[PDB]
Design a protein around this ligand. Sequence first.
Ligand SMILES: *[C@@H]1O[C@H](CO)[C@@H](O[C@@H]2O[C@H](CO)[C@@H](O[C@@H]3O[C@H](CO)[C@@H](O)[C@H](O)[C@@H]3O)[C@H](O)[C@H]2NC(C)=O)[C@H](O)[C@H]1NC(C)=O
Ligand SMILES: *[C@@H]1O[C@H](CO)[C@@H](O[C@@H]2O[C@H](CO)[C@@H](O[C@@H]3O[C@H](CO)[C@@H](O)[C@H](O)[C@@H]3O)[C@H](O)[C@H]2NC(C)=O)[C@H](O)[C@H]1NC(C)=O
Ligand SMILES: [Cu+2]
Ligand SMILES: [Cu+2]
Ligand SMILES: [Cu+2]
Ligand code: NA
Length: 499
Amino acid sequence: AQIGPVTDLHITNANISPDGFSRPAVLAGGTFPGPTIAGNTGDNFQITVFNDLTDPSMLTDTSIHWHGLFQKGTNWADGPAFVTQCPIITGQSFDYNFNVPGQAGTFWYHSHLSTQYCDGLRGPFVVYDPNDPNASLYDVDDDTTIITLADWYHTLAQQEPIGAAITADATLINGLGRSFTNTTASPLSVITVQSGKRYRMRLVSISCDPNYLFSIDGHDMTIIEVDGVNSQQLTVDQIQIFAAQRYSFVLNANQPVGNYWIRAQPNSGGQGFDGGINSAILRYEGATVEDPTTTAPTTFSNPLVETDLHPLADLGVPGQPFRGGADDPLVLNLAFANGRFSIDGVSFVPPTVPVLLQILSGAQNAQDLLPAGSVISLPSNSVIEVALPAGAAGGPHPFHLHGHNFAVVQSANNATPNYVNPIWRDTVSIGGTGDNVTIRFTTNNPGPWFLHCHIDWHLEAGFAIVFAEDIPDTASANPVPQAWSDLCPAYDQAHNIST
Ligand SMILES: *[C@@H]1O[C@H](CO)[C@@H](O[C@@H]2O[C@H](CO)[C@@H](O[C@@H]3O[C@H](CO)[C@@H](O)[C@H](O)[C@@H]3O)[C@H](O)[C@H]2NC(C)=O)[C@H](O)[C@H]1NC(C)=O
Ligand SMILES: *[C@@H]1O[C@H](CO)[C@@H](O[C@@H]2O[C@H](CO)[C@@H](O[C@@H]3O[C@H](CO)[C@@H](O)[C@H](O)[C@@H]3O)[C@H](O)[C@H]2NC(C)=O)[C@H](O)[C@H]1NC(C)=O
Ligand SMILES: [Cu+2]
Ligand SMILES: [Cu+2]
Ligand SMILES: [Cu+2]
Ligand code: NA
């Protein structure tokens, strides 16, 4: 069952064995992935998060981010630790009380403390549209049509060396999959369809690192949503999905009744499908209960290319149709050396006082804010352009902006910008050496918004900056509840920190 929009959510430690290997984890709702949180567009969500964690090897503090939800007027509820809040301590709870006006689509929730979401705190978050403009394109859209893709590690996250190339031990599809080494024939996930029906498959990358080449043998996939943004219909036979991205696609159950492999090939870790790694099963009602015998093609003839995507609505692009054609045109210098990432020469290390609390306490320019050099102010009601030229080791880096979605004016592997009709999204691969992936948005959401690589090991190694959007209006725009004001005193007391 789905939970929400008003619900408790307990965060616990437990042993799990999603690939046959037992390890302890950090779980929401007792499962991996966590339960789907759901509601309708414009609903009030009140997710009361109970921190019941006791195992220090995965951190006993926590904080949860609602990925892709704008949090307008509720920056305090966004979740990134030491940007919008201090962590919730064990034995305490906290009500994330916000609204989702003007958004409907496929989202997710995850820990936003250190690398803790890798240890298991990740689940789907769906905002349905009762008047969805795509409703007539499918028959079925429910918890059974959500498909999660996850990396899974046998080593606990707090034992992963900072700045290292960290590699997973299994791909999990809907929480199940097989280990790349010492492979055992542990259970695979089954997605069940009825011959002749059409399904809104909500594909969610809950990855901490790898991108996946996702396909379904015998089937193609008609994309209708990208990171919450409705798209024109685009039919593909393979989707390369980067960490934290989401797609809805229509699956037409139009092949013979049977069993078909579902494939998710990561860019690192185990390559291929031997022993049923990187796999799940599409089963038609009436098929024999047995593994598929289908194969993949040698090459995919209609892969997703990001410049093929276009919004369903006439979203356009803000600003002027050339590079630098914005009120505030930025170019970030994105680098890596010696185990640490940097943006504009500064490696991100979380501050002791969350950025939002520094601003509410009166710090009002970005040079007054800590960490020094990690906070860039943005002017209000202005068109922002951010060029993100690639080259830093560990690519391709999927960059994500909190508080906003953005027009993808230039995509990976294509030097031509699009000022007319590019897709809008919230997480974008910045590509490879010599690329110049560039995003645009308008500043109508006061508050400090994190910008970072969504490979969680890279964020931990410093690949982030904070956009302090409209510092002067942050306090009036974001009134804070007493429980939020109580978080830093409690956290600092529990940890013997002075502030
Ligand atoms: C990606 O696109 C951005 C624009 O969106 C390019 O930025 C431009 O970068 C050049 C230098 O690479 C800038 O010109 C230089 O400016 C300084 C003075 O500020 C001057 O001293 C140098 O002689 C040179 O003129 C230009 O200002 C800039 N545009 C913006 C908005 O900052 C960037 O080069 C592209 N990167 C790649 C790898 O293609
Ligand atoms: C590289 O990225 C560029 C920019 O996103 C892509 O260029 C765009 O290509 C599309 C598809 O061909 C062009 O749209 C077409 O326009 C014609 C004329 O209006 C129309 O009859 C077609 O039905 C379609 O709308 C679009 O104009 C063009 N934009 C620009 C700025 O060049 C390009 O396709 C990408 N390269 C690859 C290999 O995918
Ligand atoms: Cu995220
Ligand atoms: Cu986010
Ligand atoms: Cu990265
Ligand atoms: Na425009």
